[PDB]
């Protein structure tokens, strides 16, 4: 997968820090102070093996004639997710540690 470097506009994984300080949540979440949740950005192909190449010829013929075929483009989406440990306040002021799943995007890819 691609990592966003700020140069390419292809489907890439951009690093994104979520600061609990900015959103005012450091009062009930003790740790971490924040995390690199990241996200997916960039362009994808139109979305196989041998039959999909036939659809390729049909699409190219329709576009060549000024018609529009199935413009079902792919999407830049997370393909690999990791869990994150969190240490925070419970609603009764007890200290609860919970590993919250699917919190950090580690790879992006096209749907």
């Amino acid at each position: 997968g691609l990592e966003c470097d700020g140069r390419t506009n292809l489907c890439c994984r951009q690093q994104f820090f979520i600061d609990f300080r900015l959103i005012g949540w450091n009062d009930w979440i003790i740790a971490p102070t924040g995390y690199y949740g990241n996200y997916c950005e960039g362009s994808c192909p139109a979305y196989p093996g041998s039959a999909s190449s036939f659809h390729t010829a049909v699409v190219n013929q329709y576009r060549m004639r000024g018609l529009n075929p199935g413009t079902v483009n792919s999407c830049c989406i997370p393909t690999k997710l990791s869990t994150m440990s969190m240490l925070y306040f419970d609603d009764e002021y007890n200290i609860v540690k919970r590993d919250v799943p699917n919190m950090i995007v580690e790879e992006c890819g096209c749907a």
Binding site: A31, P32, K97, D99
Partner: protein
Amino acid sequence: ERLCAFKDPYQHENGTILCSKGSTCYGLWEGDINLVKQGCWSHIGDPQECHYEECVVTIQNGTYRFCCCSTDLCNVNFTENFPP
């Protein structure tokens, strides 16, 4: 897997814990400084926080001290050493 100190008064026979593969150790202390929680910290993906040979502490009360560290049982004592 790593072995970490453990303590949870919220719902340790000998004081060991089997962490999932790739986790680290953490510890939370609270006035007169006594321990509130210790165990496995599976938050990687932010090595700004969990790259330590020993437990290191860096709106909040200002009383709490949280660390995470990489070795076995390192979350038993912490240290602060900022340059003046």
